[PDB]
Symmetry: D2
Subunit: 326 residues, 4 copies
Amino acid sequence: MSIKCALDCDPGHDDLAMIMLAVYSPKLDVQYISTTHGNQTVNKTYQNARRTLNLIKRADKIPVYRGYSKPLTRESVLGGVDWSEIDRTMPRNPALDILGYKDESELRPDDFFKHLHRLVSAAEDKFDIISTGSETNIAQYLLAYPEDAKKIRMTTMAGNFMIVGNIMPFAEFNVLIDPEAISNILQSGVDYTFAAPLDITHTVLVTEKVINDIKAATEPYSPKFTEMIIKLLFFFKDTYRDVFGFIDPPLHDPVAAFHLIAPEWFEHVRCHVDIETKGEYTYGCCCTNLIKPDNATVCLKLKEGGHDAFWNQMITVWGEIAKEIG
Amino acid sequence: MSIKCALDCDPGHDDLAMIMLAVYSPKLDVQYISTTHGNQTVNKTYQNARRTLNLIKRADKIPVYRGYSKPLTRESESGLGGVDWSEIDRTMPRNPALDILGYKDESELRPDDFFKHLHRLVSAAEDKFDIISTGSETNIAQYLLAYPEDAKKIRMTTMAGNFMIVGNIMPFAEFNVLIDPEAISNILQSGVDYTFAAPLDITHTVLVTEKVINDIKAATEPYSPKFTEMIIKLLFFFKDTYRDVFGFIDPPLHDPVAAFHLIAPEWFEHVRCHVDIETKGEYTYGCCCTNLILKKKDPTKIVKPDNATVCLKLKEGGHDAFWNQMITVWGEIAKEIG
Amino acid sequence: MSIKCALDCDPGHDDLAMIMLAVYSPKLDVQYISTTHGNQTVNKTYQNARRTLNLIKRADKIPVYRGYSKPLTRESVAESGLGGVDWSEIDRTMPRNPALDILGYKDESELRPDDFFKHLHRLVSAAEDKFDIISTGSETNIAQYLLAYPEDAKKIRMTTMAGNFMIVGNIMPFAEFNVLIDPEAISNILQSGVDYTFAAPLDITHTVLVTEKVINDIKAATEPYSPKFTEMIIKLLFFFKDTYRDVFGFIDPPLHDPVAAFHLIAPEWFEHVRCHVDIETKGEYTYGCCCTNLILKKKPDNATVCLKLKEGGHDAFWNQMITVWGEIAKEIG
Amino acid sequence: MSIKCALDCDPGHDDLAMIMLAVYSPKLDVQYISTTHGNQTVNKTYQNARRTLNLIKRADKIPVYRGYSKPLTRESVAESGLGGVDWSEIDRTMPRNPALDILGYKDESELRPDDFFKHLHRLVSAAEDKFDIISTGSETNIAQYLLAYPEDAKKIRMTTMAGNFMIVGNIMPFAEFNVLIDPEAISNILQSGVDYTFAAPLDITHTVLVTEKVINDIKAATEPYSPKFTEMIIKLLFFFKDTYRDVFGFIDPPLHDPVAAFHLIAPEWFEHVRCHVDIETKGEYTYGCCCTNLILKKKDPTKIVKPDNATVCLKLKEGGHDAFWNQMITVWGEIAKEIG
Ligand SMILES: [Ca+2]
Ligand SMILES: [Ca+2]
Ligand SMILES: [Ca+2]
Ligand SMILES: [Ca+2]
């Protein structure tokens, strides 16, 4: 029936979309959300997660943990919409009651560890984590819970393989922002899938066609929600066109959750992935032996039908969210 | 009056000596001991700490935390050989740490258990809270990644590094640094107040001579001749290797020097500098590279703030003062064992 | 007006094609060829250059220098080097190397890696503005030259087949062979004040494919005049074809190095952008990566990069190439 | 009898002393001197070598080659180069460089970094066993040579002032100047199959000090014959003395490079051990570190999966320091006699 999972992310407009998908998807049973540094500081990402939840009427249900603020050994490096309402009507974070805290100042990076460890122990086979930001939190967890590595399955939006990078020439943001984390994870015995590398996500575009379907599914039920999801969806659009050459912008992170929902739409290959850490201009490069034992599965492309299947999934969820907001 | 401090270490024969010094010293008020990987796995070091405590009649008083098992981004027989621990093992009291934590038994101990306890101490600290580190510094790097803001309120006093002499386990680096150099690199750039209190520079001049041995016997055989055998077996355990591998007629005693700094810093020379820890280097990771020589050459072009104090040498009297301190404590321990 | 230039290369089937283009092109006035390690050892590449020349009736005219055998600070990575074809005749009818007379040598055993240095330096001193070098192998020879002639850097212009920029690499995930095989060389060159163009990165050369259409035009232009030459150029052209299909996914294989010479002949068919290129040397899995700030450009440059041909460029390239092959076929007869 | 050798160096006050030793030593038959970047630019070092020669009445005999100006893949860290002394006379009475006639050049502007290559290659081919090179600056020239003459590597023996092993470095915390200034060169050399001795690491040279005792012996041997030469050699010898005291802690300064030539003259005064030496190149703060497996071999010699590639001289045998200084002062005496 449905899969227990946790979300680690840095919302982020795509992470907001992925949260929406995972939560409202009946197929995924989200246990918690951990936030990490990346786009913004972990403090802002934490709030951005809670905003996503509160917008979709779930902030009283799902605990959000505020995670680690910087990479293991390196320095660090939700607009379009007014959050003032979502902010002041924000319910208390279930995480605080779990932890014994009175308020959010007491939240610490390692709060999610005990909760994850219950889930992992409970897991029949392996417990599922969707990661769509830096993977510092999981590296940290594994340094504290080495033995849990073999019982964790990870499904990530991260990497570029057969195409070049985004924020640096040959690497993708989530990897390069803390490459030791992913290197650590990959050699930890974790079961790791690169479910949504640039290879795929750059073929998953918010066209005006996709926009009309969103309007189709949501304006009927909640035309306020329509404005919001579209403003968000088009927010880094000009940069994507001008900086990167995208007439229409990609939507990265929900693809990762879609893998866990419906992996039949993805191609898969096992290989050995090396993460560049020593490299001066190339740290975060995902270098495979495709084109040493295998250590990851890589999804290089969707099967035919996959794009439509993804968008039907995504628009369904948006429709259901629009209905609840009303 | 006396200094509240915590001990992070990997016993280890010297760490055992340092624990003895810090605990029995009236000047230091040991709040807890955190153990780390190094010599042995963190699991063995943890037990080795508890053995040290139980030998000296303190295992019921001081909580011991079992810390992180491997370096941040790198790979890692009892750990306390020469001696039979079977008695100290079976008469071991419950770990105060478990009651603090809400655990029933030691299987529940996790690497990050000490974090909350350290954070109370640091918040409580008037100025800064003191940590003596004599193993890898993974635990503190980990702590600081979770408590960045606490960095400015922690003072660290370490047995680590070589500066004006070469290394031990590798040509130009010392064990505790090279075993996790990112940890120390992290710590040093975190805004922690850091002293290299006991680098090889000093500890290699702190030697367990037959003279020192006779004084130990002098102070302990009268009160507990069993304890005498034990402390001497331990003290001479890596002695042949130190002679043959390294050229030491008499072996050094490293880690208690670090605790001695916190007890009595007047016996040490000190210089501030900028220390860079080699991490990129293939044969040289863990090298403590200072700008001490740049500052003589041309102090006016130094574009890097100091970040550590380095103790390059003891003042005259320091060695005697160290050994009087150490032998006093051993004497007092011998009296309690009886 | 035709351009005095020198060729540094590691033939290599493409380098053989580039040599053919440059020599027989009236627009380029080839002064010498220096060979380097890469595909094969520099000794085999040296002979492969002489074979190219002797096949096209030029081995008595142009001096060939045998250059450096390994990278500056790295080990080499890597048949004859020019397989698919029988060289026994071209080998035994090989005329004496003009280089030996230039150098005062009796035979080829006397050739040394640094023999081209004095000859290049005359050309560079003579140059009105800058002297042109086409490089389509490792760039060890030029790095070496520049370490001996630092001051000549500002008077040398380089036009290279090297790099990948907006697409991934070939022999390694994100780097191209010629760069990664000695990345310190290119790093050295780029910070030397040399005027450098990446004229033919994978970005372009992967869109320059030996189709069966191109093959028929070759046959068209050559079989009439010399059907032996036809067999040879086609065997060579299809020699790493299966690997290109199976290893790399190419129905039809790319032809890299002649694109570099084509830049020097007719740069109007190429787009160009100036940027700062950093060559990865520290990187463990990524050495030889050409990392530019092209995308950072929203707000010093050291190279020009040609990311793509203008429309017409591919046709223009192939007309150029087939012309030359035709002219070669006529001379062999 | 006597050993054919070549000198590669960056004078430099010590290199000047080493040149004096090698040339005037009957035991060494100096074929040429190649200069390299280091202390100064290779152009100044080149002239500093010619000045050394002309001072000692040899500039008309020995060819001096001007070599490579920068490291293989790094920037230089590059005064006359030979300060404390007025060279205006030695400069204007300088005879033509024998190198120019060898090369077919009219003047010195024609000198190029790779001029010594052909001359070295004749010597190496001629060599019965191996040909000897004393290197006391950066080793860029030899790395360059070997990149052009790979096959000659097995017939070259190198005796160097370079490195620190069981003590720390000088110009950087754990490395010595000559290595760190171009570490890829030495790395290249060591893996080329060259027979390499670290004859004079800091380990030794830091125990070879120009005391006031040594100074008086110099005066003893030279003032009788040429009191002008006395002033010069002493000014030179004390020129970086204050820095050595203040920057580095030396009451009396070390004299590095002649120790290397002394090895080739009289190796019986040195201890020797074979090991595998790795040169740090990747390291950010530690490039140029000479990292040996000497300690691995005491710990567990049976696990060593790397062949030895160098001899290291960690120390002089007893008598070695006296023997060195008698050698050095003899030569200075003989030089003083010729200058008159
Ligand atoms: Ca994200
Ligand atoms: Ca220890
Ligand atoms: Ca080529
Ligand atoms: Ca020198």
